[PDB]
Amino acid sequence: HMPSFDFDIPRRSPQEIAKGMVAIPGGTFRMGGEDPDAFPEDGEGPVRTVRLSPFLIDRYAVSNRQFAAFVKATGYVTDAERYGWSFVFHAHVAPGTPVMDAVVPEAPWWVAVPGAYWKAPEGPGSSITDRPNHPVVHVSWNDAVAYATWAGKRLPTEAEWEMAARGGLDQARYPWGNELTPRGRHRCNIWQGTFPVHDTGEDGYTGTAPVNAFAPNGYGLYNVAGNVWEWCADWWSADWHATESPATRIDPRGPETGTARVTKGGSFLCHESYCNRYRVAARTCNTPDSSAAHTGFRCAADP
C-alpha cells in the first residue's frame, strides 16, 4: 500500500516509539482456528504454524487522547469527516438526532448518522469529554495508517496481531484460555443479553470501555478480545492462507490485492448467539474508508 499524506513524518527515537509497546520475540505460533461452528466464509482455518520476525505491539488500542494529539499536530481530517457520516449502533443514537435512511443489508441495528465521527461518536451533540482513555472509534483503515505512520509505527499484520493476542498460549479459544468468564469473572467487553435488543451490561459496559479495562493477556496486551474491532494491515481473503508456502507461513502479509482489510478481536457488540467473533482465531473485514462506533486499532512497530 502507498498512502498519501499532507503532513510530514516527525523524527522519533526508538525509546519514544517503544513506550507503551511490548516486544514480541521472533518465533513460531499456531495461527487460525478449527472450531466446528466457525462460519466457512470467514476462513478461520486451517490451523498452521507461522514464523514471525520480532516486533513491537501496543499494549492498548489507540485512545481518544492519543488520536487528538495526532489531529492537533497534523490537521488530519478523518474519512468520516470527509464523508460527513459514520455508523452508530441504534441504541446509542439519541432520539431526534438526524439520521440517514440508509440500510446496511442484514444488519438494521447500524445507523448511518450525519456528523458522527471520532470526537462526536454518537453524532452531533455527543462528545468524548468523559472518554479520553477509551479507544478512538470512527477511524477508518486509512485514518489508522495515517496515525500509525505519524507515530513512527504501522498496523500489525493479522499474524502479528494474533500472535500477540494469544499471549503465549497454544490454540486457546480466547486470549486468556478456553473459558469465557473463568472464576465467573468477565475478562472482556462484549454483549450480554439478547442481541440486538437489550445489552445487560453485566461486564460493566454497554459501549466502549477504557483501553486498560480488564486484566491483560500473558504478554501484557489489553482488550485484544472485545471492546473494539482492530484494523490490521492485510487485505482480506478467506483462502489465501490455505496455501502452504513461505509467503503464507513466514511473516505472512496476506494477499497482494483485495477489497476489504482485515479486522480482528471483536467488539462490545459481539455475542455468541449472533457472530461469536470474540474468539482469538476469529476474523472479519471492512472496506478501508469505512468507519464505525465499534472499530479502532492498535499499532505495531519494527524494533
Binding site: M100, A112, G266, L269, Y274, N286
Partner: peptide, 14 residues
C-alpha cells in the same frame, strides 16, 4: 440466515 455481519461498509448502503 446468512453469515453474521460485524463490519458495516460504506459501499453496502448504496
Amino acid at each position: 440466515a446468512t453469515t453474521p455481519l460485524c463490519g458495516p461498509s460504506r459501499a453496502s448502503i448504496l
